Design a protein around this ligand. Sequence first.
Ligand SMILES: *[C@@H]1O[C@H](CO)[C@@H](O[C@@H]2O[C@H](CO)[C@@H](O)[C@H](O)[C@H]2NC(C)=O)[C@H](O)[C@H]1NC(C)=O
Ligand SMILES: *[C@@H]1O[C@H](CO)[C@@H](O[C@@H]2O[C@H](CO)[C@@H](O)[C@H](O)[C@H]2NC(C)=O)[C@H](O)[C@H]1NC(C)=O
Ligand SMILES: *[C@@H]1O[C@H](CO)[C@@H](O[C@@H]2O[C@H](CO)[C@@H](O)[C@H](O)[C@H]2NC(C)=O)[C@H](O)[C@H]1NC(C)=O
Ligand SMILES: *[C@@H]1O[C@H](CO)[C@@H](O[C@@H]2O[C@H](CO)[C@@H](O)[C@H](O)[C@H]2NC(C)=O)[C@H](O)[C@H]1NC(C)=O
Ligand SMILES: *[C@@H]1O[C@H](CO)[C@@H](O)[C@H](O)[C@H]1NC(C)=O
Ligand SMILES: *[C@@H]1O[C@H](CO)[C@@H](O)[C@H](O)[C@H]1NC(C)=O
Ligand SMILES: *[C@@H]1O[C@H](CO)[C@@H](O)[C@H](O)[C@H]1NC(C)=O
Ligand SMILES: *[C@@H]1O[C@H](CO)[C@@H](O)[C@H](O)[C@H]1NC(C)=O
Ligand SMILES: *[C@@H]1O[C@H](CO)[C@@H](O)[C@H](O)[C@H]1NC(C)=O
Ligand SMILES: *[C@@H]1O[C@H](CO)[C@@H](O)[C@H](O)[C@H]1NC(C)=O
Lengths: 311, 211, 116
Amino acid sequence: DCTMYICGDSTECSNLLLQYGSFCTQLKRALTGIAVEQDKNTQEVFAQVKQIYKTPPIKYFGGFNFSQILPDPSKPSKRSPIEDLLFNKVKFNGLTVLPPLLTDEMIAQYTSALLAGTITSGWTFGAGPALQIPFPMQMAYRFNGIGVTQNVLYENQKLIANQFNSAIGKIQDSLSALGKLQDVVNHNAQALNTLVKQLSSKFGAISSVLNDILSRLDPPEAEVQIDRLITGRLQSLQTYVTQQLIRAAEIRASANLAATKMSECVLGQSKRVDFCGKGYHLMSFPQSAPHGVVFLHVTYVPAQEKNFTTA
Amino acid sequence: GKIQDSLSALGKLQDVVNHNAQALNTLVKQLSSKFGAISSVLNDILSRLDPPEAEVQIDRLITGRLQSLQTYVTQQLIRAAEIRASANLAATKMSECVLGQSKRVDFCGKGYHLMSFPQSAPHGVVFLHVTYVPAQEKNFTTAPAICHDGKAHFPREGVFVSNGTHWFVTQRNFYEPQIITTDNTFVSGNCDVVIGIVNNTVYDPLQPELD
Amino acid sequence: CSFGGVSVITPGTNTSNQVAVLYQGVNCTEVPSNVFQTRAGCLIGAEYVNNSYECDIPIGAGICASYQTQSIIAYTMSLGAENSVAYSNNSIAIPTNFTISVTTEILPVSMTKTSV
Ligand SMILES: *[C@@H]1O[C@H](CO)[C@@H](O[C@@H]2O[C@H](CO)[C@@H](O)[C@H](O)[C@H]2NC(C)=O)[C@H](O)[C@H]1NC(C)=O
Ligand SMILES: *[C@@H]1O[C@H](CO)[C@@H](O[C@@H]2O[C@H](CO)[C@@H](O)[C@H](O)[C@H]2NC(C)=O)[C@H](O)[C@H]1NC(C)=O
Ligand SMILES: *[C@@H]1O[C@H](CO)[C@@H](O[C@@H]2O[C@H](CO)[C@@H](O)[C@H](O)[C@H]2NC(C)=O)[C@H](O)[C@H]1NC(C)=O
Ligand SMILES: *[C@@H]1O[C@H](CO)[C@@H](O[C@@H]2O[C@H](CO)[C@@H](O)[C@H](O)[C@H]2NC(C)=O)[C@H](O)[C@H]1NC(C)=O
Ligand SMILES: *[C@@H]1O[C@H](CO)[C@@H](O)[C@H](O)[C@H]1NC(C)=O
Ligand SMILES: *[C@@H]1O[C@H](CO)[C@@H](O)[C@H](O)[C@H]1NC(C)=O
Ligand SMILES: *[C@@H]1O[C@H](CO)[C@@H](O)[C@H](O)[C@H]1NC(C)=O
Ligand SMILES: *[C@@H]1O[C@H](CO)[C@@H](O)[C@H](O)[C@H]1NC(C)=O
Ligand SMILES: *[C@@H]1O[C@H](CO)[C@@H](O)[C@H](O)[C@H]1NC(C)=O
Ligand SMILES: *[C@@H]1O[C@H](CO)[C@@H](O)[C@H](O)[C@H]1NC(C)=O
C-alpha cells in the first residue's frame, strides 16, 4: 500500500503525496503484472493433463513397486511418502501477502494424474487417447528406444524390477538438496524485512515520524521536512519493485525449463543428452515440492566392460 | 480451413504495444508535476525569479524529471530482455519446427509433429502446427513373445495381439495385422525366462514352397 | 487496525453493470445479500456454490467468479474430467484410425524503438 507505506495514517500527508504524480499507480501496475504471471507459471508446469487419471486398486505392476511415489490413502493430504519429506525441509505497515490461486491439494492432483497416466499408458495419453499396454512391455519399448534389444528385459524382468525397487528406495535416505527452494523464500523475506526497516531512517530530516514534525514545527518548515522523508521512502519502493521484476524474470525462466522438462521427460522419452538425468533416459516421475517441482530421473547405465578385437 | 474461423488469440502481440504506449503516456504526464517546487513550466519559474533564486527551484524540477528518465530507461532494458528471450525461442522453433521434423514433446504443437508453416504477424510470428493424432482405439490381449519349437520369438518391430481366437503381429501406431512368420521375428533365448510367453504357431515360408 | 486493498470484479460493462468486491484477508465482520468467507478474504456480491466450472475470472486460492443463467457466482475451479484407464496385465489398446490436427502458436519478436 503506497500511501500507508510512505505517509502512514497521517492525512495531511495524503495531499502532499498527490503532488508527485502517478508514482503510486506505477507501483500497483508493476506488481500486478508479477502477481498474474506467478499463477500462470504454475499452470504451465503442472496443468498439462486434461483428465484426472487414477490407478487401479490392485496396484501391482508386474513387480515394480511404486508405493513411494503414489499417494498414501491413509492421510488427509493424500501426499506421497516422498512428497511428505519434500515439504518438511522448506503482516506489516501496508505490506500484504496474497494467497496462490491453486492450493497444494490441487497440485497434488495434477501430479497423481501424471503418474497414473504414465504407469498405465506410457506416453500415449499426451498425444491423444490413453492407450493401455502392460507396464513390463512399456519398459521393453523404452530399452528399444535407446538401442538395446528388447529381450534384455523380457528374460531379466525380475532382476530389473528388484534392482529398480532398491534404487528408488535409496532416494529417501539421501533426503532424510532443496536449497534452491529455500533461497526463493529467503530472497523475498529479506526484501520485506529491509523494506520495513527503511522506515526508521531520517534521510537528513529533523525526525523520521511525520506526526512528530508537526508537533514541534510550523507548516512552512514541516512541508519541507515531510517532503524529504516522502522522497526517501518513495525511492525505497522504486528499489523494491525494480528488483521484484528482475527476480521474477529468473523464476519465470525456471518455470519455462520445468514446463519443458515436464513435457519432454515425463510425457515422452528424450534423446537430449543430460536433459533428463545422467545416463540413458528411460523414464521420469514428477513429485510436488513447495514452490517447485522434483523430477525422479530413471536412467540406463552400462557396467562391467570387456575388451575385444574388432574389424 | 477451420483456422480462419477461430480468428475472424493475438493478445500477446497487443500487450507489447500496450506496454510501450503506457510508458510513453506516463513519461509525458510526469512533466506536469511540481515535486514540491514553485511551478512546472521551466519558463514561469524563470520569468519570475532571479538567477540565484530560480536556480534552487529549477534544480528540484531537473532532479525530478531526471529520475523519470532513469525509471523509463531501466524498465526498457528489463523488458527488452524478455522480448529478446521470446525472439530466441521463435528463432529456435523456426529452425526446429519449420526447417525440420522434431521429436521434442510439445515443442511443435500437440500431437505427433509432422510439419509446420510460418505466417507473419505484426511484431511477431505465427506457427501453424500440423500434427498426427491417433483415434478410435480397440483393446486386445497381448504377450511379449511366442514359443515355437521350444524357442522364444520376439517381434522385430510391433506388438503381438489377439483378436479372441488368433494371434497377429501389428505395428504399434496403426492397427494392421500380419501373420507371424520367421521373417517378421527374431529368436533369442528359450521359453523359460520370459514371463507371460504364450504358445502359438510361427509359419516358415520355406516348407510350403518345397511342398 | 485492519486494512487491505480493494479491487472491483466486473464481468465487463459490455455485458452487465454489476460488480463484486473482495476485501483481501478482511473478515466479513470488520468490513464496514451474498456474503461468503474464504481463506483469501471476504467476498461480497457473489454466491458460493459447490459445483465446479472452468476458471473464468480468477479470484484466488481456488475460487473464480463469472456470469451464469444473470448474476455473478464464485465456485471452486475443478481440475478436469475424471477418467480411469482400463489397465490390466495382458490388455493393450491400439488405434485403428487417425486425424490430422492444426494448432496455432504465437510469439512476439520485437518492440517499437524509442528515443528521448
Ligand atoms: C513396496 O515397498 C514398501 C516399502 O517401501 C513395502 O512396504 C513395506 O513392506 C515391509 C515388508 O516387506 C514391511 O515391513 C513394511 O512395514 C512396509 N511398509 C509400509 C509403510 O507398509 C510394500 O510391501 C511394497 N509393495 C509390494 C507389493 O511389494
Ligand atoms: C479373428 O480373425 C480371424 C481371421 O479373420 C477369424 O477367423 C476366421 O479365419 C478363417 C481362416 O482361418 C477365415 O476364413 C474366416 O473368414 C475367419 N472368420 C472371420 C469371422 O473373420 C476369427 O473369426 C477372428 N476372431 C474373432 C473372435 O473375431
Ligand atoms: C506350450 O507348449 C509347450 C510345448 O508343448 C508346453 O510344454 C509342455 O508342458 C506340459 C505341461 O503343461 C508338459 O507335460 C510337457 O512335457 C511340455 N512339453 C515339452 C515339449 O516340454 C507348455 O506347457 C505349453 N504352455 C501352455 C501354457 O499350455
Ligand atoms: C477413418 O475415419 C474417417 C472419418 O474421419 C472415415 O472416412 C469416412 O467414412 C465414411 C463411411 O464410414 C464416409 O461416409 C465418409 O465420407 C468418410 N470421410 C471422409 C472424410 O472421407 C474412414 O472410413 C475411417 N476408417 C475406418 C477404417 O473406419
Ligand atoms: C582392456 O585392455 C586395456 C589394455 O589394452 C586395459 O587397460 C583395460 O583395463 C582392459 N579392460 C578390461 C575391462 O579389462
Ligand atoms: C477396453 O476395455 C476396458 C475394460 O477392460 C474398457 O473400459 C474400455 O472402454 C475398452 N476400450 C474400448 C475402445 O472399448
Ligand atoms: C494377471 O492377473 C490375474 C489376477 O488379477 C492373474 O489371474 C493372471 O494370471 C495374471 N496374468 C499374468 C500374465 O500374470
Ligand atoms: C461491445 O459493444 C460494441 C458496440 O458498442 C460491440 O461492437 C462489441 O461486440 C461488444 N463487445 C462484446 C464482448 O459484446
Ligand atoms: C470472523 O469473525 C468471527 C467472529 O466474530 C469468526 O467466527 C470468523 O471465523 C472470522 N472469520 C475469519 C475468516 O477469520
Ligand atoms: C458444500 O459441501 C459441504 C460438504 O462438503 C457442505 O458442508 C456445504 O454446506 C456445501 N455448500 C453448499 C452451499 O451447499
